[PDB]
Amino acid sequence: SGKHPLVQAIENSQLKTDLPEFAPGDTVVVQVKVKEGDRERLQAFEGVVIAKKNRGLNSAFTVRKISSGVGVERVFQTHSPVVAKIEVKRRGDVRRAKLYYLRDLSGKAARIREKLP
Amino acid sequence: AIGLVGRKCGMTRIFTDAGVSVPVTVIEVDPNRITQIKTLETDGYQAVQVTTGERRESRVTNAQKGHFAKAGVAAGRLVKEFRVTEAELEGREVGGTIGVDLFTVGQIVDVTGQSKGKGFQGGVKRWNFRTQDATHGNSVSHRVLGSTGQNQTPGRVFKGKKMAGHLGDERVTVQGLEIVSVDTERSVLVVKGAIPGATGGDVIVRPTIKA
Amino acid sequence: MIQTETMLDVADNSGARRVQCIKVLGGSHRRYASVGDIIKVTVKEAIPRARVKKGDVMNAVVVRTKFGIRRPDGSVIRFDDNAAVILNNNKAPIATRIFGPVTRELRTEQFMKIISLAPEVL
Amino acid sequence: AVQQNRKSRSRRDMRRSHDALTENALTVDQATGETHRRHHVTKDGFYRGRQLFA
Amino acid sequence: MRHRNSGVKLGRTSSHRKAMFENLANSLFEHELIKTTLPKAKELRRVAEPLITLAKNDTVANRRLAFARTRNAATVGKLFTVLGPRYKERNGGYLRVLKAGFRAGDAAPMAYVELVDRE
RNA sequence: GUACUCUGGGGAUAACAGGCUGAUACCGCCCAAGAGUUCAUAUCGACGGCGGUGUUUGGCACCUCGAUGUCGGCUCAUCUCAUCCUGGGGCUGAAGCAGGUCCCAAGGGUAUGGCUGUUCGCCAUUUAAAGAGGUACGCGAGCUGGGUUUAGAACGUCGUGAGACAGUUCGGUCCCUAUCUACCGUGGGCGCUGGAAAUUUGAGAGGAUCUGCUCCUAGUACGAGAGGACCAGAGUGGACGAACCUCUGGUGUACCGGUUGUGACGCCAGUCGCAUCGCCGGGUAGCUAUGUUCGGAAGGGAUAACCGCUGAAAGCAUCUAAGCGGGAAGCCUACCUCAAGAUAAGAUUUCCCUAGGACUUUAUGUCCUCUAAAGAGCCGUUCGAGACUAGGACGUUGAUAGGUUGGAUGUGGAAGCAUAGUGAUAUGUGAAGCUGACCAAUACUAAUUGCUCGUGAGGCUUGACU
RNA sequence: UAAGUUCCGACCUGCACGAAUGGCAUAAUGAUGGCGGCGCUGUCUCCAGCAGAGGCUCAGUGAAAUCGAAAUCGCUGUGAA
RNA sequence: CAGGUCGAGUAGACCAAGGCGCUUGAGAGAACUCUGCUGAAGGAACUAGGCAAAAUGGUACCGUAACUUCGGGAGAAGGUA
RNA sequence: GAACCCACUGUCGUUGAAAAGCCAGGGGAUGACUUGUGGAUAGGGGUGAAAGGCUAAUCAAGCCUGGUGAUAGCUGGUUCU
RNA sequence: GUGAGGGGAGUGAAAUAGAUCCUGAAACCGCAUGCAUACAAGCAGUGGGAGCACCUUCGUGGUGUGACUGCGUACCUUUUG
Numbered sequence A: 001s002g003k004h005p006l007v008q009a010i011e012n013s014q015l016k017t018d019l020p021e022f023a024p025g026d027t028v029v030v031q032v033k034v035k036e037g038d039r040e041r042l043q044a045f046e047g048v049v050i051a052k053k054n055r056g057l058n059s060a061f062t063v064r065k066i067s068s069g070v071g072v073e074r075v076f077q078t079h080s081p082v083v084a085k086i087e088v089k090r091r092g093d094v095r096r097a098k099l100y101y102l103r104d105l106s107g108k109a110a111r112i113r114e115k116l117p
Numbered sequence B: 001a002i003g004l005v006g007r008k009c010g011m012t013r014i015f016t017d018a019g020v021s022v023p024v025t026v027i028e029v030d031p032n033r034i035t036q037i038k039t040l041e042t043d044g045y046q047a048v049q050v051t052t053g054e055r056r057e058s059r060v061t062n063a064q065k066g067h068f069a070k071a072g073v074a075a076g077r078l079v080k081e082f083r084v085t086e087a088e089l090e091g092r093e094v095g096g097t098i099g100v101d102l103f104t105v106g107q108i109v110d111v112t113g114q115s116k117g118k119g120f121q122g123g124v125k126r127w128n129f130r131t132q133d134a135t136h137g138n139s140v141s142h143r144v145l146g147s148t149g150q151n152q153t154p155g156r157v158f159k160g161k162k163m164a165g166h167l168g169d170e171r172v173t174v175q176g177l178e179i180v181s182v183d184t185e186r187s188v189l190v191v192k193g194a195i196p197g198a199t200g201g202d203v204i205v206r207p208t209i210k211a
Numbered sequence C: 001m002i003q004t005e006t007m008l009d010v011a012d013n014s015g016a017r018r019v020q021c022i023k024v025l026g027g028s029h030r031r032y033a034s035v036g037d038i039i040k041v042t043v044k045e046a047i048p049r050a051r052v053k054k055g056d057v058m059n060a061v062v063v064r065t066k067f068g069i070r071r072p073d074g075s076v077i078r079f080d081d082n083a084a085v086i087l088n089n090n091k092a093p094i095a096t097r098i099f100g101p102v103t104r105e106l107r108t109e110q111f112m113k114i115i116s117l118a119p120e121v122l
Numbered sequence D: 001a002v003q004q005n006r007k008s009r010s011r012r013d014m015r016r017s018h019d020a021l022t023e024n025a026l027t028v029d030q031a032t033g034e035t036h037r038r039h040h041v042t043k044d045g046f047y048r049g050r051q052l053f054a
Numbered sequence E: 001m002r003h004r005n006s007g008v009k010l011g012r013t014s015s016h017r018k019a020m021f022e023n024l025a026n027s028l029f030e031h032e033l034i035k036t037t038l039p040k041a042k043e044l045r046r047v048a049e050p051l052i053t054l055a056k057n058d059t060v061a062n063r064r065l066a067f068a069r070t071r072n073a074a075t076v077g078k079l080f081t082v083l084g085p086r087y088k089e090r091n092g093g094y095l096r097v098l099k100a101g102f103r104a105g106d107a108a109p110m111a112y113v114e115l116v117d118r119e
Numbered sequence F: 001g002u003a004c005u006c007u008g009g010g011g012a013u014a015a016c017a018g019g020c021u022g023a024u025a026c027c028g029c030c031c032a033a034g035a036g037u038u039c040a041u042a043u044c045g046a047c048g049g050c051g052g053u054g055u056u057u058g059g060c061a062c063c064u065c066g067a068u069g070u071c072g073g074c075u076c077a078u079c080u081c082a083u084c085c086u087g088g089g090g091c092u093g094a095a096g097c098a099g100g101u102c103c104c105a106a107g108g109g110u111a112u113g114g115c116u117g118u119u120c121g122c123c124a125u126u127u128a129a130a131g132a133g134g135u136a137c138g139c140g141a142g143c144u145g146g147g148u149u150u151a152g153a154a155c156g157u158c159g160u161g162a163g164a165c166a167g168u169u170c171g172g173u174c175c176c177u178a179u180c181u182a183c184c185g186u187g188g189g190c191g192c193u194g195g196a197a198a199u200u201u202g203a204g205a206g207g208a209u210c211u212g213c214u215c216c217u218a219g220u221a222c223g224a225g226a227g228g229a230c231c232a233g234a235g236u237g238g239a240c241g242a243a244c245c246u247c248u249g250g251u252g253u254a255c256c257g258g259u260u261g262u263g264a265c266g267c268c269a270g271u272c273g274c275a276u277c278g279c280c281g282g283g284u285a286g287c288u289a290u291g292u293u294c295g296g297a298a299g300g301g302a303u304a305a306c307c308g309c310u311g312a313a314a315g316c317a318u319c320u321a322a323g324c325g326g327g328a329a330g331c332c333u334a335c336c337u338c339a340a341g342a343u344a345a346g347a348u349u350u351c352c353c354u355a356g357g358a359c360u361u362u363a364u365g366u367c368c369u370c371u372a373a374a375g376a377g378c379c380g381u382u383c384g385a386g387a388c389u390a391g392g393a394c395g396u397u398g399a400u401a402g403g404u405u406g407g408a409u410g411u412g413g414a415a416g417c418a419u420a421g422u423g424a425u426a427u428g429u430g431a432a433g434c435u436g437a438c439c440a441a442u443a444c445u446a447a448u449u450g451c452u453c454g455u456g457a458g459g460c461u462u463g464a465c466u
Numbered sequence G: 001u002a003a004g005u006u007c008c009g010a011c012c013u014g015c016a017c018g019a020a021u022g023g024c025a026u027a028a029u030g031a032u033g034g035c036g037g038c039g040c041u042g043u044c045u046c047c048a049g050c051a052g053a054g055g056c057u058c059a060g061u062g063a064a065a066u067c068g069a070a071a072u073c074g075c076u077g078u079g080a081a
Numbered sequence H: 001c002a003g004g005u006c007g008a009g010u011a012g013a014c015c016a017a018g019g020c021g022c023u024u025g026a027g028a029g030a031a032c033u034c035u036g037c038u039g040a041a042g043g044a045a046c047u048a049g050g051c052a053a054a055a056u057g058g059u060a061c062c063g064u065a066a067c068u069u070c071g072g073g074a075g076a077a078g079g080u081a
Numbered sequence I: 001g002a003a004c005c006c007a008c009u010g011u012c013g014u015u016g017a018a019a020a021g022c023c024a025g026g027g028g029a030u031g032a033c034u035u036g037u038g039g040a041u042a043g044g045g046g047u048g049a050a051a052g053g054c055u056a057a058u059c060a061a062g063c064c065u066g067g068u069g070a071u072a073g074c075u076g077g078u079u080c081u
Numbered sequence J: 001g002u003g004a005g006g007g008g009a010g011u012g013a014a015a016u017a018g019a020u021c022c023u024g025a026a027a028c029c030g031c032a033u034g035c036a037u038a039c040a041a042g043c044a045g046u047g048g049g050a051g052c053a054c055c056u057u058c059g060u061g062g063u064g065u066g067a068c069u070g071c072g073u074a075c076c077u078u079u080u081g
């Protein structure tokens, strides 16, 4: 809430209200709307959350995965309608907010320990 | 054409149902109050003068106090004219009010503002000049102008030569912006894209001159 | 964001393994190439007994970049490498297999073969 | 770089035409009656009634 | 350009500036009235007033924070036993800065910094 | 012999640039044998003739030898048109698509690399195109110093030798704080027919001016076939420019954390100083591009080459002599910005000042007393404004700045205590503690009491209205 | 090498190599000359942000080379050109 | 002459005994200049030339080519803790 | 590889802090080594692992004083009506 | 400021003979009065010439200034120039 109240009201008018709770280090699945022609479908994007930005309607989060041997990252915008659904598969236990050190690790070295209840 | 005077409130985004993120600028509009109508007979041209905002009486001078009292409107923080034709001039009278409903969603507009001031600036920033070599023997000549002219002929520097000096803090008009939202409850315009100036600056919104 | 002297991997089985960009095609003073753009390359390393040979000058299309691509919702997608797919003299793919994911900007009638052969389109 | 001709006294004085000094803003302190610099503590330590040094 | 930036430089490195302002705060808390240059006096508020706000509440953690910021046991004791109780009900503004002419050696503008209820 | 060198002189006399000239150079025109299946002139054009320009090679020796101190590269340019692309046309040995040739047109645009000191040149790959030239072969008190042309050394060659070169090779100090003119920005003064606060007209000035590809018309017109349009519409790019920070990132030495060495705070614990911010991982505002948005759209007027209508001189013919049209990225407008020092100093709205004496230089007269307006400034709190200025906001009838309170964000589990461990550590209290610049409230602190400037109805002549 | 007036190997009409003004080689050595590669990078595409020191303003002290005299504009022409 | 903690050390970081803060200051936080830190994607495309900068860097063990004057090359290269 | 002795590269400095330096890198560092004190060699002479190098900030013939007011077919200047 | 310096007083024929003190020029630098000067382009003068101020024998006069206007590119040397 570092913006003017009018901007805050205009932004708050468009907030999603069913977002789950997740943190860096968690592995998540994102259902992404894909529209070609008149054809609509949901594509799954599963991976580790390596960064989270809490900025109200300007919130974002970065998901990293290994796809066919090639690392790929996507920075989703949390309140965008293209993000249909987010599910948390497993909760991770980490020591810092940003996990960029994972980019230089491969295989067993990049494993994230599960957070035990 | 007749337009509106407002204040830049900040930038944000609007999400569409398809998921497209549209970057937008929000313009607060305190409804403009007409203070004077200028005609061919008395002024030689046709314009509508408006004021907006508020100003304390200790800052309002006596001449301006009388000028506002003749129209019968509260003193504003600024006064500004719009050139008009007879068709736009009809229906407007001294003491009336112009609101955000002058515009419609989807309309294309031009927005004028006062750009941010960068102060004294050099050739690289002001005119996109290229720097010289950082290494390879260069002596204290990394961001300098270089040559400024020819030899004995013509033996002078031409007018308009690009040099260092004040950059920014000038009137700038941006054309082709689309009205994204017209909120009458909050008296707000939401336009697509960026507009000149800093947050809190005064801006002018007019119908586009390009077609 | 590919420019001249940039080295790229090859995401196909045409035989080339590393290529170097020698020109960004499609305009005077054009600086950079992104996903879906055509470049001229020289082949720096190839597997033995292949149609392509080391030292050949060919066309290619960029399919993966580290700088990444933007999407209409404001997101960005970044890859771990810079990868290209070799084309022939009339700018058509010459390979039969595609390795690694590709993006939806390749969904044109010119590059639909890459979309069909890729393991992942994202 | 250096002049090719000595500058005349008239031109030198014309350049100096912007060198004049100005007065400070002085004011009588109503609490004490002495002249003081406006918005400043007096030399004896008074300012708008309060007194600093016992 | 320095649009919307806070802080001063005063021709010093960052560590030297921080040490100087710590010394100034200690001297102010000890004597309750000091004379310095006007820019130093104005910047000293942003360093000194939060210390009094912190000292309003007496806890071990607050005392250790005050000691980390002042490195003066006498200053910590005076803050937590005298100044904080004195300003418990004051909503900021524990200092006043008053212009005091110029300095003979270099014509530098000067000011007095004083605690609000000193004596 | 002197390149190890020195003195007195010369622009009386050479090398650079300038000047005169134009043999040479480049460009243009006249005649026309012939070539072109016939057919000089679609395109070429022998033998000969006449000019233009002032980019070449030269001639002369007028300026400079009490110094005009540079081959190329870099940075930054400005002009010409004999036009490279884009625009408009005539002819064709122009079916179409293309091409050839000539005319008009200077608005904009007009490659990156390998080799070499190169200019040039050859080569690779692009582009709509990679134009030709002038500007001290533009630019070294703006940069460099690879080549050439000091002093060292060597090779080939010449000389008995000192030494030398239609040569080669390795190495080899680039000074100047800008007075005047000019230019880029930014102020002070006065003027503008009493003074003041605002809003303005536009005589004029500057900026901008580029273009690819795909689809469609339509596989239509054209053509035997192969191929394949004009005109007219959509979509999407390159380069360039501006504004902006919502998004994506960079930075972020006054924000948070991990960690090494050492010293200290009496000790443990907890902290702080120093070591590039010690090092390392993140990161708020601001600034910023590689990020975002937008622009060169459309239309009027006069024209260039060119094409005409009607029409005589000259019973015909003829775009022309009367008269009437069409016609280009070019000109004037149109778009953006500046603009009344436009001394021709413009216009509109509103506001302020309505006192007495003496005297003679009898007048917008000179001296006394009274009066001090509308406003402006000094000063202070300051700013997304700024070198100083100027400009914007506010000064108690107050949110201008700091602080305080709340929120937001970042970091990521404070200290103390308690549990489990032999212990390093782990867990709970608790997503805690701390959080520059952000948002919102709040007179707690500082914007005090003030002073200075600016006056007192604004000359005369004539005309029209009263 | 995509592209090599440089580099390496070979050829020999050696303008004008050649045997102690030594010839041809040679391990090691060289702040020696030429060419190529890996890593690396603000050298560059193309620059951005930040830190310190100047620059700028105020107070004090206080130079320099130069200088016939200056009321010291543009263009085209003229003219020790 | 020359102490302490680490250290091979008289190298180096921080300290002891013992000395100093270098005889103009105060503000501001523009262009430009000097000295530093970081930098998206690319990685010599820069340039006469990788000039400058970036980079490597310790101890123990393993392992180490052509060539050679048998000494070297060699800390070759490379790897583990 | 420090001290010590050198001077290969670059930025800065060039009316400098300095009439040859600073900073970051660089070479030698038990030897043909570096260095204190006191001596010897004197100008067509000395000395030189040789650059015409050095011989008191001076070297293809040191400095000082005399011949000496050298000579100059050269340049400059030459005073009231 | 028990400073420097000055104003009175006093001495002296004279102190503007007051101590770096006879006379006291010029370059150069101040203050005061009069006139001119902020729409106009250049060796700064010269030949004309309105107005203003002071004086005055009251003018067909004297002193200072100089709006506006015609003409007008320093001096020396050396040179065909």
Ligand SMILES: NCCC[C@H](N)CC(=O)NCCC[C@H](N)CC(=O)NCCC[C@H](N)CC(=O)N[C@@H]1[C@H](O)[C@@H](OC(N)=O)[C@@H](CO)O[C@H]1NC1=N[C@@H]2C(=O)NC[C@@H](O)[C@H]2N1
Pocket: H019, H020, H021
């Ligand atoms: N009768 C009249 C006599 C007249 C006399 N002749 C005049 C004269 O000679 N002037 C010389 C001016 C030099 C200097 N600027 C003076 C000054 O003003 N110093 C400011 C300090 C004053 C302060 N209030 C006292 C202070 O902190 N003391 C400390 C202390 O003793 C001690 O520290 C610890 N931790 O124990 C010591 C460490 O060894 O260091 C001293 N500090 C020091 N700072 C000094 C420095 O830098 N250099 C010289 C010497 O003075 C140094 N010591």
Ligand SMILES: NCCC[C@H](N)CC(=O)NCCC[C@H](N)CC(=O)NCCC[C@H](N)CC(=O)N[C@@H]1[C@H](O)[C@@H](OC(N)=O)[C@@H](CO)O[C@H]1NC1=N[C@@H]2C(=O)NC[C@@H](O)[C@H]2N1
Pocket: J019
């Ligand atoms: N209304 C205003 C009032 C204001 C108020 N009142 C304030 C006021 O008034 N303040 C006054 C300040 C004035 C000043 N500051 C004081 C000052 O200056 N004192 C000077 C004191 C000492 C002075 N230096 C000594 C002196 O003079 N030595 C000289 C010197 O050795 C030499 O001379 C030269 N040239 O070489 C020699 C040659 O002869 O002579 C000597 N002398 C001789 N004298 C003799 C003579 O005459 N005959 C015979 C023989 O014995 C002569 N020799």
